[PDB]
Amino acid sequence: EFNILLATDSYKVTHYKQYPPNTSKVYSYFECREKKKYEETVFYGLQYILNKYLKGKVVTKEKIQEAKDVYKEHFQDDVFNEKGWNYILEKYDGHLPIEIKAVPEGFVIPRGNVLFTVENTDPECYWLTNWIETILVQSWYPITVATNSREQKKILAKYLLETSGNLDGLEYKLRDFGYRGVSSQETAGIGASAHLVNFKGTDTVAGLALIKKYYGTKDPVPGYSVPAAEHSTITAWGKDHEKDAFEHIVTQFSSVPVSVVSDSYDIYNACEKIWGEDLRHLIVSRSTQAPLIIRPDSGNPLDTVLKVLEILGKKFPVTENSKGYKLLPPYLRVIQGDGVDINTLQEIVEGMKQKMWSIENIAFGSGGGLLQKLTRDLLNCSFKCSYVVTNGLGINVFKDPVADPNKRSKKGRLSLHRTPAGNFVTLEEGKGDLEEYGQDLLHTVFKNGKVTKSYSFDEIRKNAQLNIELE
Amino acid sequence: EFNILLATDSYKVTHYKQYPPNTSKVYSYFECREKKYEETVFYGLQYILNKYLKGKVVTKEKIQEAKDVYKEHFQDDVFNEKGWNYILEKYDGHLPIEIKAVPEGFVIPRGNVLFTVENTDPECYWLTNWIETILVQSWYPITVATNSREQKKILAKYLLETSGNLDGLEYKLRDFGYRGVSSQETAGIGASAHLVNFKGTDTVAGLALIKKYYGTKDPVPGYSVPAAEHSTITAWGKDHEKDAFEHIVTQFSSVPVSVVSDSYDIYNACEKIWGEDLRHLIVSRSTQAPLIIRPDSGNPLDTVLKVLEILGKKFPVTENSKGYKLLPPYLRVIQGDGVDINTLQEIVEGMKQKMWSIENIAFGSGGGLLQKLTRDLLNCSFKCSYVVTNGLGINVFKDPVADPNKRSKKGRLSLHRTPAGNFVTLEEGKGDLEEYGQDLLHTVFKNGKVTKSYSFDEIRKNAQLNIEL
Ligand SMILES: O=C(/C=C/c1cccnc1)NCCCCC1CCN(C(=O)c2ccccc2)CC1
Ligand SMILES: O=C(/C=C/c1cccnc1)NCCCCC1CCN(C(=O)c2ccccc2)CC1
C-alpha cells in the first residue's frame, strides 16, 4: 500500500531540523516559470493527485513505524520526525493539516503565474508544506502533456481552416498511440487523460478509467478508437500474401472505419498496385461512414505522406474543394503514425499545404512524442517557498541566483487576478489584499485532508478550448 | 484494481479477427534493435511478470468490465468475450503463455533477442500480441539501467585516471529524479534501474520495489545523507544566509551534510561565508562527516571549476599520487543541476584539464537520469517472427523499403555464445542444428507461473563494468 511518509525526496526527511527556530508557517507556490515557445499552459492533473494520494487518513501507526525502519537503514542514522508525524495522527486522525489553493483545472494561463499554493494550517506542521513538494510537482507531467497536445491542436486548426474552410473533425485528428512508449502503467493513464483534454481519439485505454474515477464525463467515455491492423496481422499471412491479408481485414471490417498498415514490405507498391489496382473494387464501394484509412509507418514522414497522396491521387478520383485544395474520395483517408511530434506535425501539414493537399485527407497518430518525450524543464514547472512566519512576523522569501536570473522566484503571499484588459497577473507581497484587482482566481481545493472543490472533465475541456474554437 | 483486459492498445482488441484463419501459434520477440549505446542492460521484466501477468489475472467481473468499456469506446461490439472466457474456464484465469528471457542484469549488444513470447494453447493465438503493450514497457527500466551504466563508465575512466582507483564510484552519481518523473510508479521503476549500477538515491520509491520484487542481502539497496534545499536556506531571510548555514552544519555536525549554496551568490557563499565566516566550523569536521557544498545554477562546467578554484584558495589542498589536486577530506562538492550523460563527460574532462581529481566531486541527476529518455534511444521493439497456420510453421517478418533499420528477425529465435565468447542470435530455428551450443535464454514464465527469477544482488553482479571485474 502507498505510504505518504515514503513518498518524498529522501533529503526532505531532514528538513524539519533546518528551518529557522520558531517557524509557524511555510507557504509555497507552483508556477511554470518564464524563461528569457509554449507561452501559455493548461492547468490539469492536480485533482488526481489530491484524491489518489493526499486525502483522508493517510497517516497510520503502521506507516509511521514502516518509515522509521526504512529511514534508519537508508540514512544509517536515526533522523526522522517521528514526533511530527505522530502529532498529525493523534490530533487530526492522520489527515494532512494543509491548505491548497489552485486555479481551476482546464484554465489556460500564461507562463510565470502562480497556479497553486500550499501552506500548513497548524503551526506544528510547518515542515509538512514542503514534504509534499515532490508528489505535487509531478503535476508537471499532465500539465505538460495537456499543453503540448493543445499546441498541436492549434497547428492542426490553423491548417485545417486554411485548406478546408472549417474545423470539422479537428478533435479526431491527433490520436494517442503512446501506451507502449511510456514508462509505466500509471504514467499511461495520466498522460492519456491529459491528451483527452484536447482530443477525443486514443488507443491508450488506461486514460478512460482514470477520467471516470477522478473527474467524470456526461458521455459514457471520454475517448474513442477504431479497428486497425498492426504489422503482425499483415505479416502472419506470409510475405507473398500481403494482398490476402488486406482483403481479409477490409472485409472483416467492411462497415466501420478501418486502418491498415501498408508498409510491411513496400508502402508504394501497396498503395499503387494492391490498394490502387488489385483491391480497388473493395475500396470504392465503401460507405462515407466506413473509410479505409491507409497507414504508412516508415521513411521520412513528410516525404512519405506526399508520395502516398501523389500515388492515391492518380489511382482514385480526386476533387478540388472550395478553397482550391485536393481531396481524396470520402471512402479513403490516410493516417501518419510514425515519427510525429510537434515539430514534424508542423512540417507535414505545411508540406501538404504547399503541394495543395487539404488537411482533411490526413489524421495523425503520436506515441513517444505525445506522452514520453517531455520533461519538467519544457515549461519550467517549479515549486518554491515564498513566505514564512517566524517569531510571529511574516517575511517574504525567495531565491535569486547570481548566475541565472531565470531561476529567481516570487516573494511573499501570492494571488492571481484578471487585468483590466482581460489578461492575467500574479500579485506578490500580499498585494492582492489591497483589492485593486478584483477577485483572486485561486480557489481552495484541499483543506485538512478533504478535497473542497472538484471539476468534471467536461468543465476542464470547456476551460481548455482554443480561441479559434470559441470563434 | 488492475485489469489486463484493459491494459493493451485499443486496436489490439480487434486483432483476433485479422490473423489468418486456423492460426494456432503466434511467436514474438523483443530486441533493442541495431542501427553510442552499443550494449544494453536487461532489467525489469521480473517486475512486470510478478505485478501484472502471473496468477489469476482474468475474472468474470474483469471480463464484464472490459466488455462494457469497449462497447462504448469502439461504439460497437468487437471485444473477444469468448476468448477471455475460455482462459477463465480452462485455466482458472491464468495466461497460457510461455516467455523465455536472458538473465536480468545481463549486458548484451544491440540487435540480439532478449525475450520471446508464445501461446501454449492453440485457442489463445491472439494472446501473444495482446500483451505486447505491457511487455514493451520494459524499454524503460532497460534504458534507465543502460544509460546509468554508461555514466558509470565515464566516471570510472576519469576517477581511475585522476586518483588511481575506483573507491567510492558507486556513490558518485545520485538519483535526484523523484519530482521530475511522470508518476509514482515510474519513480519506483526508474530508481530501481539506477540502483543496478549505483547505491546513492533520494527516490525513496525504488527501495520498496526492489524489496518486493527482487530482494537484497542488505537491509536496503540504496542510501542518502542529510542535505538542504533552497527553502531551508531562504526561510531565514536574505540577510541571514550565514545563520542558515551555521545552524544546518551544527545540527548535522557528525554526519555528512550537503548545503545548497547558490540561493543568492554561490561565489560569495564559497569564498566569504564558508571560506571565511564559518571556516572554523568546517575544518573541525570528521573525515566521516564532510561538508558537501552544492552549486545549483549557472553553466555546470564553469561553475564547478570556479567553485573548486575558490575553495582551493581558502582551504588546504593536497596533490595526490597521480598529480591531481584534492580538497581536504572534510570538504567536497556536489553538482546536481543540468547533469546528463553529455554534461557529465564535459565536467569531468574539464576538471581533468584543470588538474582537479574526480575524488572531489559527486553528481546528482534528475530529469536527465529518469525522464529524458524514450523508447527510440535503444530502439526497443516487439515483433512477430513465427506463426503456425493450418499446421504449417512460417517464418514471418517486416522489411519496409524505405527503412532497412526497421527490418525484423525471421522465425524461431535463440541466443548463443560464439567461439570467441560473444553473443549471437540465430534465426529460422537454426539453434536446433546444435552448431552453436545451448540457448542462453531461460523460461521465466509459463502458464501463469514465474519459473525463474533473480535477486537484486545477482542482477548487480551481472551488470558490473569490465574495469570493476
Ligand atoms: O491506425 C490506428 C492505430 C494504430 C496504432 C495504435 C496503437 C499503437 N500503435 C499504432 N488507428 C486508426 C485510427 C485512425 C482512424 C481515422 C481517424 C479520423 N477518422 C474519422 O474521424 C472518421 C471519419 C469518417 C467516419 C468515421 C470516422 C477516420 C478514421
Ligand atoms: O545534495 C543532496 C540532495 C539534493 C537533492 C535531492 C533530491 C532532489 N533534489 C536535490 N544530497 C547530498 C549527496 C551527497 C553525496 C556525497 C557522495 C559521496 N560521499 C560519500 O561517499 C561519503 C563520504 C564520507 C562519509 C560518508 C559518505 C559524500 C556525500
Residue numbers in the entry:
A (entry chain A): 8 to 43, 53 to 487
B (entry chain B): 8 to 42, 53 to 486
Sentences from the paper on this structure:
NAMPT functions as a homo-dimeric enzyme that catalyzes the rate limiting step in the primary salvage pathway for NAD synthesis, the transfer of a phosphoribosyl residue from 5-phosphoribosyl-1-pyrophosphate (PRPP) to nicotinamide (NAM) to produce nicotinamide mononucleotide (NMN). Crystal structures of NAMPT in numerous ligand-bound forms have been reported. These structures consistently display a NAMPT homo-dimer with two essentially identical active sites at the dimer interface. Typical NAMPT inhibitors were found to occupy the portion of active site responsible for NAM binding and a tunnel-shaped cavity extending from the NAM binding site. Furthermore, we determine the crystal structures of six NAMPT mutants in the apo form and in complex with various inhibitors and present a definitive model to explain the differential effects of the mutations on various structural classes of NAMPT inhibitors.
A previously published in silico model predicted that H191R would protrude its side chain into the tunnel and sterically block inhibitors like APO866 from binding. When tested across a panel of structurally diverse inhibitors, H191R reduced potency across the compound families, but remained more sensitive to APO866 and GMX1778 than series A inhibitors. The R191 side chain indeed occupied part of the volume inside the tunnel region, but did not completely block the tunnel passage, thus imposing a more stringent limit on the size of linker moieties in the inhibitor molecules. The bi-aryl sulfone group of series A compounds exceeded the available space, whereas the more flexible and narrower linker of APO866 can fit through the altered tunnel.
